């Protein structure tokens, strides 16, 4: 349904975006970019260039096998400057691969998923229902849903905090 690209102006300056602005990995060295207000200056995050205020949208995300990624959605007002917590209260609703386990990033304790190995995941954002849902593409098996009372523009969110993993809008 939606054709997203990663917004380079939002990306932490250590992130490396592929030529087509669909893939993201982490570099060791910070690239020299202007510190625009929208840019995440500390946490390893990037948003898509397009966000959603209403309706039902979906996209798919190819995921690395190694630890260090999280993705889902973020409210537009998610803090860009400073070190932020990666939590629903701070405006991020995401799955994560960390410690060899898949998680829904619930607070104050993350929720472990029993879903087996993931390769590509569909993200379904419904702003009339008030939910963001994740499915393993191979059989559209439901992984997790956050129900949320979204009341602003919601952006696709990606984060990569290890040099050994990646995400790709696919
Ligand atoms: C030479 O090789 C490397 C490898 C990694 C890094 C690097 C650079 C910057 C960050 C980190 C690592 C790092 O871990 N960062 C966390 C936040 C944090 C800050 C300080 C101390 C500990 C943690 C971060 O942003 N975490 C993610 C969590 C979501 C996810 N992706 O799972 C987030 O909040 O978006 C930020 C530098 N050089």
Short mmCIF file of N, CA and C and ligand atoms in Angstrom, two decimals:
data_model
loop_
_atom_site.label_atom_id
_atom_site.label_comp_id
_atom_site.label_asym_id
_atom_site.label_seq_id
_atom_site.Cartn_x
_atom_site.Cartn_y
_atom_site.Cartn_z
N UNK A 1 0.85 -1.22 0.00
CA UNK A 1 0.00 0.00 0.00
C UNK A 1 0.87 1.26 0.00
N UNK A 2 1.93 1.38 0.84
CA UNK A 2 2.71 2.61 0.83
C UNK A 2 4.16 2.36 0.39
N UNK A 3 4.69 3.35 -0.37
CA UNK A 3 6.04 3.35 -0.92
C UNK A 3 6.91 4.31 -0.10
N UNK A 4 7.55 3.80 0.95
CA UNK A 4 8.29 4.67 1.83
C UNK A 4 9.76 4.75 1.44
N UNK A 5 10.34 5.89 1.79
CA UNK A 5 11.79 6.05 1.79
C UNK A 5 12.20 6.65 3.13
N UNK A 6 13.43 6.32 3.53
CA UNK A 6 14.02 6.82 4.74
C UNK A 6 14.38 8.28 4.52
N UNK A 7 14.12 9.08 5.56
CA UNK A 7 14.36 10.50 5.53
C UNK A 7 15.78 10.76 6.03
N UNK A 8 16.71 11.15 5.14
CA UNK A 8 18.10 11.36 5.57
C UNK A 8 18.31 12.46 6.61
N UNK A 9 17.43 13.47 6.62
CA UNK A 9 17.53 14.60 7.54
C UNK A 9 17.21 14.20 8.99
N UNK A 10 16.43 13.12 9.18
CA UNK A 10 16.13 12.57 10.50
C UNK A 10 17.21 11.61 11.02
N UNK A 11 18.09 11.07 10.14
CA UNK A 11 18.88 9.91 10.54
C UNK A 11 20.03 10.32 11.44
N UNK A 12 20.18 9.59 12.54
CA UNK A 12 21.39 9.68 13.35
C UNK A 12 22.61 9.69 12.43
N UNK A 13 23.61 10.58 12.64
CA UNK A 13 24.71 10.70 11.68
C UNK A 13 25.66 9.50 11.58
N UNK A 14 25.59 8.54 12.49
CA UNK A 14 26.28 7.27 12.32
C UNK A 14 25.57 6.29 11.40
N UNK A 15 24.24 6.45 11.20
CA UNK A 15 23.55 5.58 10.26
C UNK A 15 24.02 5.82 8.83
N UNK A 16 24.07 4.72 8.09
CA UNK A 16 24.33 4.71 6.66
C UNK A 16 23.04 4.24 5.95
N UNK A 17 22.54 5.09 5.05
CA UNK A 17 21.38 4.79 4.22
C UNK A 17 21.87 4.37 2.84
N UNK A 18 21.26 3.30 2.31
CA UNK A 18 21.53 2.79 0.97
C UNK A 18 21.17 3.85 -0.09
N UNK A 19 21.65 3.71 -1.32
CA UNK A 19 21.39 4.70 -2.39
C UNK A 19 19.91 4.97 -2.60
N UNK A 20 19.09 3.93 -2.44
CA UNK A 20 17.69 4.06 -2.77
C UNK A 20 16.89 4.48 -1.55
N UNK A 21 17.57 4.78 -0.43
CA UNK A 21 16.94 5.26 0.79
C UNK A 21 15.93 4.25 1.34
N UNK A 22 16.16 2.95 1.10
CA UNK A 22 15.31 1.93 1.69
C UNK A 22 16.05 1.10 2.74
N UNK A 23 17.40 1.05 2.68
CA UNK A 23 18.11 0.21 3.63
C UNK A 23 18.93 1.02 4.61
N UNK A 24 19.10 0.49 5.82
CA UNK A 24 19.80 1.23 6.87
C UNK A 24 20.64 0.27 7.67
N UNK A 25 21.86 0.77 7.91
CA UNK A 25 22.84 0.04 8.73
C UNK A 25 23.54 1.08 9.61
N UNK A 26 24.34 0.61 10.56
CA UNK A 26 25.11 1.51 11.41
C UNK A 26 26.57 1.49 11.04
N UNK A 27 27.11 2.69 10.91
CA UNK A 27 28.56 2.86 10.80
C UNK A 27 29.24 3.19 12.14
N UNK A 28 30.54 2.94 12.24
CA UNK A 28 31.29 3.33 13.43
C UNK A 28 31.45 4.84 13.53
N UNK A 29 31.63 5.55 12.40
CA UNK A 29 32.00 6.95 12.50
C UNK A 29 30.83 7.82 12.09
N UNK A 30 30.67 8.92 12.81
CA UNK A 30 29.59 9.83 12.52
C UNK A 30 29.91 10.57 11.23
N UNK A 31 28.98 10.56 10.27
CA UNK A 31 29.10 11.39 9.09
C UNK A 31 28.89 12.85 9.48
N UNK A 32 29.46 13.77 8.71
CA UNK A 32 29.40 15.19 9.02
C UNK A 32 28.20 15.80 8.28
N UNK A 33 27.08 15.90 9.00
CA UNK A 33 25.80 16.39 8.50
C UNK A 33 25.34 17.57 9.37
N UNK A 34 24.56 18.55 8.87
CA UNK A 34 24.00 19.61 9.74
C UNK A 34 23.08 19.11 10.85
N UNK A 35 23.09 19.72 12.06
CA UNK A 35 22.28 19.19 13.16
C UNK A 35 20.84 19.74 13.09
N UNK A 36 20.08 19.39 12.01
CA UNK A 36 18.71 19.87 11.78
C UNK A 36 17.86 19.45 12.95
N UNK A 37 16.83 20.25 13.31
CA UNK A 37 15.96 19.92 14.44
C UNK A 37 15.34 18.52 14.41
N UNK A 38 15.03 18.02 13.20
CA UNK A 38 14.41 16.72 13.07
C UNK A 38 15.39 15.55 13.23
N UNK A 39 16.71 15.82 13.29
CA UNK A 39 17.66 14.72 13.27
C UNK A 39 17.83 14.15 14.67
N UNK A 40 17.76 12.83 14.77
CA UNK A 40 18.10 12.15 16.00
C UNK A 40 19.61 12.29 16.25
N UNK A 41 19.98 12.90 17.37
CA UNK A 41 21.38 13.26 17.54
C UNK A 41 22.12 12.23 18.39
N UNK A 42 21.43 11.27 18.99
CA UNK A 42 22.05 10.39 19.96
C UNK A 42 21.58 8.96 19.78
N UNK A 43 20.25 8.74 19.81
CA UNK A 43 19.79 7.38 19.56
C UNK A 43 19.86 7.07 18.06
N UNK A 44 20.02 5.77 17.75
CA UNK A 44 20.34 5.32 16.40
C UNK A 44 19.08 5.15 15.52
N UNK A 45 18.33 6.24 15.33
CA UNK A 45 17.01 6.16 14.72
C UNK A 45 16.93 6.99 13.43
N UNK A 46 15.98 6.58 12.60
CA UNK A 46 15.59 7.27 11.38
C UNK A 46 14.09 7.01 11.16
N UNK A 47 13.40 8.01 10.63
CA UNK A 47 11.99 7.89 10.23
C UNK A 47 11.93 7.85 8.71
N UNK A 48 10.83 7.31 8.19
CA UNK A 48 10.46 7.57 6.81
C UNK A 48 10.15 9.06 6.60
N UNK A 49 10.17 9.48 5.33
CA UNK A 49 9.92 10.87 4.98
C UNK A 49 8.43 11.18 5.03
N UNK A 50 7.61 10.14 5.07
CA UNK A 50 6.16 10.31 5.09
C UNK A 50 5.56 9.71 6.34
N UNK A 51 4.64 10.48 6.93
CA UNK A 51 3.85 10.01 8.05
C UNK A 51 2.36 10.04 7.74
N UNK A 52 1.60 9.48 8.69
CA UNK A 52 0.19 9.21 8.48
C UNK A 52 -0.64 9.82 9.60
N UNK A 53 -1.73 10.51 9.22
CA UNK A 53 -2.63 11.18 10.16
C UNK A 53 -3.98 10.48 10.23
N UNK A 54 -4.28 9.62 9.26
CA UNK A 54 -5.57 8.95 9.26
C UNK A 54 -5.49 7.74 8.36
N UNK A 55 -6.49 6.85 8.47
CA UNK A 55 -6.57 5.73 7.56
C UNK A 55 -5.69 4.54 7.94
N UNK A 56 -5.58 3.61 6.98
CA UNK A 56 -4.96 2.31 7.16
C UNK A 56 -3.84 2.18 6.12
N UNK A 57 -2.62 1.92 6.62
CA UNK A 57 -1.46 1.79 5.76
C UNK A 57 -0.59 0.61 6.19
N UNK A 58 0.14 0.02 5.24
CA UNK A 58 1.06 -1.06 5.57
C UNK A 58 2.32 -0.98 4.72
N UNK A 59 3.41 -1.49 5.30
CA UNK A 59 4.65 -1.64 4.56
C UNK A 59 5.35 -2.88 5.09
N UNK A 60 6.49 -3.24 4.47
CA UNK A 60 7.16 -4.46 4.87
C UNK A 60 8.61 -4.11 5.16
N UNK A 61 9.22 -4.88 6.08
CA UNK A 61 10.57 -4.60 6.55
C UNK A 61 11.35 -5.92 6.57
N UNK A 62 12.44 -5.94 5.81
CA UNK A 62 13.39 -7.04 5.81
C UNK A 62 14.33 -6.81 6.99
N UNK A 63 14.59 -7.86 7.75
CA UNK A 63 15.30 -7.76 9.00
C UNK A 63 16.57 -8.62 8.98
N UNK A 64 17.67 -8.08 9.54
CA UNK A 64 18.90 -8.85 9.70
C UNK A 64 18.74 -9.96 10.75
N UNK A 65 19.60 -10.97 10.66
CA UNK A 65 19.54 -12.09 11.57
C UNK A 65 20.23 -11.76 12.89
N UNK A 66 21.11 -10.74 12.91
CA UNK A 66 21.84 -10.42 14.11
C UNK A 66 21.15 -9.34 14.94
N UNK A 67 21.45 -9.34 16.25
CA UNK A 67 20.94 -8.36 17.18
C UNK A 67 21.25 -6.93 16.75
N UNK A 68 20.35 -6.03 17.18
CA UNK A 68 20.60 -4.61 17.16
C UNK A 68 19.60 -3.75 16.41
N UNK A 69 18.47 -4.35 15.98
CA UNK A 69 17.48 -3.54 15.27
C UNK A 69 16.20 -3.46 16.09
N UNK A 70 15.48 -2.37 15.85
CA UNK A 70 14.10 -2.23 16.30
C UNK A 70 13.37 -1.40 15.26
N UNK A 71 12.09 -1.71 15.04
CA UNK A 71 11.34 -0.91 14.09
C UNK A 71 9.86 -0.98 14.44
N UNK A 72 9.15 0.04 13.96
CA UNK A 72 7.70 0.04 14.05
C UNK A 72 7.23 1.43 13.65
N UNK A 73 6.66 2.17 14.61
CA UNK A 73 6.20 3.54 14.37
C UNK A 73 6.54 4.39 15.59
N UNK A 74 6.53 5.71 15.34
CA UNK A 74 6.78 6.72 16.35
C UNK A 74 5.85 7.89 16.08
N UNK A 75 5.33 8.45 17.16
CA UNK A 75 4.64 9.71 17.01
C UNK A 75 5.61 10.78 16.58
N UNK A 76 5.08 11.75 15.83
CA UNK A 76 5.92 12.79 15.28
C UNK A 76 6.68 13.54 16.37
N UNK A 77 6.07 13.73 17.55
CA UNK A 77 6.66 14.53 18.62
C UNK A 77 7.73 13.75 19.41
N UNK A 78 8.08 12.55 18.98
CA UNK A 78 9.14 11.79 19.62
C UNK A 78 10.38 12.69 19.68
N UNK A 79 11.05 12.69 20.82
CA UNK A 79 12.16 13.62 21.02
C UNK A 79 13.33 13.22 20.14
N UNK A 80 13.91 14.21 19.47
CA UNK A 80 15.03 13.98 18.54
C UNK A 80 16.38 14.24 19.23
N UNK A 81 16.42 15.22 20.12
CA UNK A 81 17.69 15.67 20.71
C UNK A 81 17.81 15.09 22.11
N UNK A 82 19.00 14.58 22.40
CA UNK A 82 19.28 14.02 23.70
C UNK A 82 19.13 12.51 23.69
N UNK A 83 19.50 11.91 24.80
CA UNK A 83 19.36 10.50 24.91
C UNK A 83 17.95 10.22 25.42
N UNK A 84 17.20 9.45 24.64
CA UNK A 84 15.83 9.15 24.97
C UNK A 84 15.68 7.67 25.29
N UNK A 85 14.67 7.32 26.14
CA UNK A 85 14.28 5.92 26.30
C UNK A 85 13.55 5.40 25.07
N UNK A 86 13.67 4.09 24.80
CA UNK A 86 13.04 3.48 23.66
C UNK A 86 11.79 2.79 24.18
N UNK A 87 10.73 3.59 24.38
CA UNK A 87 9.52 3.12 25.07
C UNK A 87 8.25 3.73 24.50
N UNK A 88 7.09 3.06 24.69
CA UNK A 88 5.79 3.61 24.32
C UNK A 88 5.52 4.99 24.91
N UNK A 89 5.90 5.19 26.18
CA UNK A 89 5.64 6.46 26.84
C UNK A 89 6.39 7.59 26.12
N UNK A 90 7.53 7.23 25.50
CA UNK A 90 8.34 8.20 24.78
C UNK A 90 7.99 8.26 23.30
N UNK A 91 6.98 7.51 22.89
CA UNK A 91 6.37 7.70 21.58
C UNK A 91 6.90 6.74 20.52
N UNK A 92 7.33 5.53 20.93
CA UNK A 92 7.85 4.54 20.02
C UNK A 92 7.17 3.22 20.32
N UNK A 93 6.67 2.62 19.24
CA UNK A 93 5.99 1.34 19.31
C UNK A 93 6.64 0.40 18.31
N UNK A 94 7.41 -0.58 18.83
CA UNK A 94 8.36 -1.31 18.01
C UNK A 94 8.56 -2.75 18.48
N UNK A 95 9.00 -3.59 17.51
CA UNK A 95 9.61 -4.89 17.78
C UNK A 95 11.12 -4.72 17.77
N UNK A 96 11.79 -5.65 18.45
CA UNK A 96 13.23 -5.53 18.63
C UNK A 96 13.86 -6.92 18.66
N UNK A 97 15.08 -7.03 18.09
CA UNK A 97 15.91 -8.23 18.22
C UNK A 97 17.13 -7.88 19.05
N UNK A 98 17.24 -8.53 20.22
CA UNK A 98 18.25 -8.15 21.21
C UNK A 98 18.49 -9.35 22.11
N UNK A 99 19.76 -9.69 22.35
CA UNK A 99 20.03 -10.85 23.18
C UNK A 99 19.62 -12.17 22.54
N UNK A 100 19.44 -12.21 21.21
CA UNK A 100 19.05 -13.42 20.50
C UNK A 100 17.55 -13.72 20.57
N UNK A 101 16.80 -12.78 21.16
CA UNK A 101 15.37 -12.94 21.38
C UNK A 101 14.62 -11.82 20.65
N UNK A 102 13.41 -12.13 20.17
CA UNK A 102 12.54 -11.09 19.62
C UNK A 102 11.66 -10.57 20.75
N UNK A 103 11.42 -9.26 20.72
CA UNK A 103 10.66 -8.59 21.76
C UNK A 103 9.64 -7.64 21.14
N UNK A 104 8.49 -7.49 21.81
CA UNK A 104 7.73 -6.26 21.69
C UNK A 104 8.21 -5.30 22.77
N UNK A 105 8.51 -4.06 22.39
CA UNK A 105 9.12 -3.16 23.35
C UNK A 105 8.03 -2.46 24.16
N UNK A 106 7.49 -3.27 25.09
CA UNK A 106 6.55 -2.84 26.11
C UNK A 106 7.34 -2.28 27.29
N UNK A 107 6.64 -1.55 28.16
CA UNK A 107 7.28 -0.87 29.27
C UNK A 107 6.45 -1.14 30.53
N UNK A 108 7.04 -1.32 31.74
CA UNK A 108 8.48 -1.16 31.96
C UNK A 108 9.34 -2.39 31.66
N UNK A 109 8.69 -3.51 31.33
CA UNK A 109 9.37 -4.72 30.90
C UNK A 109 8.97 -5.02 29.45
N UNK A 110 9.98 -5.31 28.61
CA UNK A 110 9.73 -5.76 27.25
C UNK A 110 9.06 -7.13 27.30
N UNK A 111 8.32 -7.44 26.24
CA UNK A 111 7.60 -8.70 26.16
C UNK A 111 8.28 -9.61 25.15
N UNK A 112 8.80 -10.77 25.58
CA UNK A 112 9.40 -11.73 24.66
C UNK A 112 8.36 -12.38 23.75
N UNK A 113 8.68 -12.49 22.47
CA UNK A 113 7.82 -13.14 21.49
C UNK A 113 8.31 -14.57 21.26
N UNK A 114 7.37 -15.51 21.12
CA UNK A 114 7.68 -16.86 20.68
C UNK A 114 7.26 -17.03 19.22
N UNK A 115 8.03 -16.47 18.30
CA UNK A 115 7.63 -16.47 16.90
C UNK A 115 8.61 -17.19 15.97
N UNK A 116 9.74 -17.69 16.49
CA UNK A 116 10.77 -18.29 15.63
C UNK A 116 11.46 -17.25 14.74
N UNK A 117 12.32 -17.70 13.81
CA UNK A 117 13.16 -16.79 13.04
C UNK A 117 12.34 -15.91 12.08
N UNK A 118 12.65 -14.61 12.09
CA UNK A 118 12.01 -13.62 11.23
C UNK A 118 12.97 -13.16 10.14
N UNK A 119 12.40 -12.95 8.95
CA UNK A 119 13.12 -12.55 7.76
C UNK A 119 12.52 -11.27 7.20
N UNK A 120 11.19 -11.26 7.06
CA UNK A 120 10.50 -10.07 6.59
C UNK A 120 9.20 -9.95 7.38
N UNK A 121 8.87 -8.71 7.75
CA UNK A 121 7.75 -8.45 8.65
C UNK A 121 6.87 -7.37 8.03
N UNK A 122 5.53 -7.60 8.04
CA UNK A 122 4.62 -6.56 7.57
C UNK A 122 4.17 -5.72 8.75
N UNK A 123 4.19 -4.40 8.56
CA UNK A 123 3.72 -3.48 9.58
C UNK A 123 2.39 -2.89 9.09
N UNK A 124 1.34 -3.01 9.91
CA UNK A 124 0.03 -2.48 9.56
C UNK A 124 -0.38 -1.42 10.58
N UNK A 125 -0.47 -0.16 10.12
CA UNK A 125 -0.84 0.96 10.97
C UNK A 125 -2.27 1.38 10.65
N UNK A 126 -3.18 1.25 11.65
CA UNK A 126 -4.55 1.64 11.47
C UNK A 126 -4.93 2.74 12.47
N UNK A 127 -5.16 3.95 11.94
CA UNK A 127 -5.39 5.13 12.77
C UNK A 127 -6.86 5.33 13.11
N UNK A 128 -7.76 4.58 12.45
CA UNK A 128 -9.18 4.61 12.79
C UNK A 128 -9.39 3.62 13.93
N UNK A 129 -8.77 2.43 13.81
CA UNK A 129 -8.82 1.43 14.86
C UNK A 129 -8.00 1.88 16.07
N UNK A 130 -6.82 2.50 15.80
CA UNK A 130 -5.84 2.86 16.81
C UNK A 130 -4.99 1.65 17.20
N UNK A 131 -4.15 1.22 16.26
CA UNK A 131 -3.36 0.02 16.44
C UNK A 131 -2.20 0.04 15.46
N UNK A 132 -1.09 -0.56 15.89
CA UNK A 132 0.00 -0.90 14.98
C UNK A 132 0.32 -2.38 15.19
N UNK A 133 0.29 -3.13 14.09
CA UNK A 133 0.38 -4.58 14.10
C UNK A 133 1.54 -5.03 13.22
N UNK A 134 2.07 -6.20 13.58
CA UNK A 134 3.21 -6.81 12.95
C UNK A 134 2.90 -8.25 12.64
N UNK A 135 3.27 -8.66 11.42
CA UNK A 135 3.07 -10.02 10.95
C UNK A 135 4.33 -10.50 10.24
N UNK A 136 4.64 -11.79 10.44
CA UNK A 136 5.64 -12.49 9.64
C UNK A 136 5.01 -12.80 8.28
N UNK A 137 5.70 -12.39 7.20
CA UNK A 137 5.14 -12.31 5.87
C UNK A 137 4.87 -13.73 5.35
N UNK A 138 5.76 -14.68 5.70
CA UNK A 138 5.75 -16.04 5.16
C UNK A 138 4.40 -16.74 5.30
N UNK A 139 3.54 -16.32 6.24
CA UNK A 139 2.19 -16.88 6.34
C UNK A 139 1.22 -15.87 6.94
N UNK A 140 1.59 -14.58 6.89
CA UNK A 140 0.98 -13.49 7.63
C UNK A 140 0.55 -13.92 9.04
N UNK A 141 1.40 -14.65 9.76
CA UNK A 141 1.16 -14.96 11.16
C UNK A 141 1.34 -13.68 11.98
N UNK A 142 0.36 -13.41 12.83
CA UNK A 142 0.37 -12.23 13.67
C UNK A 142 1.41 -12.39 14.77
N UNK A 143 2.24 -11.37 14.92
CA UNK A 143 3.29 -11.38 15.93
C UNK A 143 2.87 -10.62 17.17
N UNK A 144 2.41 -9.38 16.98
CA UNK A 144 2.07 -8.52 18.08
C UNK A 144 1.27 -7.31 17.60
N UNK A 145 0.39 -6.82 18.49
CA UNK A 145 -0.24 -5.54 18.25
C UNK A 145 -0.12 -4.64 19.48
N UNK A 146 0.24 -3.36 19.23
CA UNK A 146 0.02 -2.30 20.19
C UNK A 146 -1.29 -1.58 19.87
N UNK A 147 -2.23 -1.51 20.83
CA UNK A 147 -3.33 -0.58 20.67
C UNK A 147 -2.96 0.75 21.28
N UNK A 148 -3.20 1.82 20.53
CA UNK A 148 -2.77 3.15 20.90
C UNK A 148 -3.81 4.15 20.45
N UNK A 149 -4.01 5.20 21.26
CA UNK A 149 -4.86 6.31 20.88
C UNK A 149 -4.02 7.38 20.21
N UNK A 150 -3.70 7.11 18.95
CA UNK A 150 -2.91 8.00 18.13
C UNK A 150 -3.69 9.30 17.97
N UNK A 151 -3.03 10.42 18.23
CA UNK A 151 -3.67 11.72 18.16
C UNK A 151 -2.80 12.76 17.46
N UNK A 152 -1.81 12.29 16.70
CA UNK A 152 -0.97 13.13 15.86
C UNK A 152 -0.47 12.29 14.69
N UNK A 153 0.40 12.86 13.84
CA UNK A 153 1.03 12.20 12.70
C UNK A 153 1.99 11.12 13.22
N UNK A 154 1.86 9.93 12.63
CA UNK A 154 2.64 8.77 13.02
C UNK A 154 3.58 8.38 11.87
N UNK A 155 4.87 8.16 12.20
CA UNK A 155 5.90 7.89 11.21
C UNK A 155 6.44 6.48 11.34
N UNK A 156 6.67 5.78 10.21
CA UNK A 156 7.53 4.58 10.24
C UNK A 156 8.88 4.87 10.88
N UNK A 157 9.29 3.98 11.79
CA UNK A 157 10.47 4.14 12.62
C UNK A 157 11.39 2.96 12.42
N UNK A 158 12.71 3.27 12.37
CA UNK A 158 13.76 2.27 12.22
C UNK A 158 14.91 2.64 13.15
N UNK A 159 15.53 1.63 13.77
CA UNK A 159 16.68 1.89 14.61
C UNK A 159 17.64 0.73 14.49
N UNK A 160 18.95 1.06 14.37
CA UNK A 160 19.99 0.05 14.23
C UNK A 160 21.14 0.47 15.14
N UNK A 161 21.40 -0.31 16.19
CA UNK A 161 22.37 0.05 17.19
C UNK A 161 23.58 -0.90 17.22
N UNK A 162 23.70 -1.79 16.24
CA UNK A 162 24.87 -2.63 16.05
C UNK A 162 25.34 -2.54 14.61
N UNK A 163 26.67 -2.56 14.39
CA UNK A 163 27.25 -2.57 13.07
C UNK A 163 27.06 -3.89 12.35
N UNK A 164 26.47 -4.89 13.00
CA UNK A 164 26.35 -6.20 12.41
C UNK A 164 24.96 -6.52 11.85
N UNK A 165 24.02 -5.55 11.86
CA UNK A 165 22.66 -5.89 11.45
C UNK A 165 22.10 -4.76 10.59
N UNK A 166 20.87 -4.95 10.09
CA UNK A 166 20.28 -3.94 9.21
C UNK A 166 18.77 -4.13 9.17
N UNK A 167 18.13 -3.12 8.57
CA UNK A 167 16.73 -3.14 8.16
C UNK A 167 16.63 -2.58 6.74
N UNK A 168 15.64 -3.11 6.02
CA UNK A 168 15.38 -2.61 4.66
C UNK A 168 13.87 -2.54 4.37
N UNK A 169 13.41 -1.36 3.98
CA UNK A 169 12.04 -1.22 3.49
C UNK A 169 11.93 -2.01 2.17
N UNK A 170 11.17 -3.12 2.15
CA UNK A 170 11.14 -4.06 1.02
C UNK A 170 9.71 -4.34 0.60
C1 LIG B 1 32.27 0.85 16.67
O1 LIG B 1 31.05 0.17 16.83
C2 LIG B 1 29.98 0.90 17.25
C3 LIG B 1 28.86 0.18 17.52
C4 LIG B 1 27.78 0.87 18.03
C5 LIG B 1 27.83 2.24 18.24
C6 LIG B 1 26.66 2.97 18.78
C7 LIG B 1 26.46 4.34 18.58
C8 LIG B 1 25.39 5.01 19.16
C9 LIG B 1 24.50 4.30 19.94
C10 LIG B 1 24.69 2.94 20.14
C11 LIG B 1 25.74 2.26 19.56
C12 LIG B 1 23.58 2.43 20.96
O2 LIG B 1 23.41 1.32 21.36
N1 LIG B 1 22.77 3.48 21.22
C13 LIG B 1 21.54 3.32 21.99
C14 LIG B 1 21.42 4.36 23.11
C15 LIG B 1 22.58 4.31 24.07
C16 LIG B 1 23.38 5.42 24.26
C17 LIG B 1 24.48 5.36 25.11
C18 LIG B 1 24.78 4.19 25.78
C19 LIG B 1 23.99 3.08 25.60
C20 LIG B 1 22.90 3.14 24.74
C21 LIG B 1 20.35 3.37 21.05
O3 LIG B 1 20.14 4.34 20.33
N2 LIG B 1 19.54 2.30 21.11
C22 LIG B 1 18.39 2.09 20.24
C23 LIG B 1 17.62 0.88 20.74
C24 LIG B 1 16.64 0.34 19.69
C25 LIG B 1 17.28 -0.78 18.91
N3 LIG B 1 17.89 -0.45 17.78
O4 LIG B 1 17.32 -1.93 19.37
C26 LIG B 1 17.41 3.29 20.21
O5 LIG B 1 17.15 3.86 21.30
O6 LIG B 1 16.95 3.62 19.08
C27 LIG B 1 23.24 4.73 20.63
C28 LIG B 1 29.03 2.86 17.92
N4 LIG B 1 30.09 2.21 17.42
#
